[PDB]
Assembly symmetry: C2
């Protein structure tokens, strides 16, 4: 079956969808420890804007608390903790202004 | 509500999930025309492997046919066509052998 154009276009459009977020990406300062999992799946804005120069960007967001395991790299001891991650609730195709 | 560890781990695990695939990525030779949408959403393997050195890779796949609009960049004339895309059906955390 050929997937209809409207359906194809609808799914690739800029919107919030499940996205993998490395803990190190959300928290650049967490450079020493081991985390399990090393990334989390939360909703983030993504899609190919009709105007190819625009970026799918969040215009709405909230925070979600996730249980993560922190592992001490030297002793290998594990400990559970709650870690906050930004989740996108609304998205729009926006221009990326030229900085500088 | 804090999302439980098991649920967190389950979603970030290597598995097939909705992924944006630019038409130019699937077809590197399609360098001249304009496509609407410019990318499609199909299932692809992604996730953070428990062993951080391993890559989430497909071990099963099939092809899906999608309706895409091809636009002539000089005349701006549109035409619908069916375009094939690889979709991943099974995934595994596999080693990335050092080439060379």
């Amino acid at each position: 079956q050929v997937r209809p154009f409207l359906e194809v276009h609808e799914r690739s459009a800029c919107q919030a969808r499940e996205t993998l977020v490395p803990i190190l990406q959300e928290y650049p300062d967490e450079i020493s420890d081991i985390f399990r999992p090393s990334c989390v799946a939360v909703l983030r804005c993504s899609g190919c804007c009709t105007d190819e120069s625009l970026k799918c960007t969040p215009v709405g967001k909230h925070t979600v608390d996730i249980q993560i395991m922190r592992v001490n790299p030297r002793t290998q001891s594990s400990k559970m903790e709650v870690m906050k991650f930004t989740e996108h609730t609304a998205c729009e195709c926006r221009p990326r202004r030229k900085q500088g």
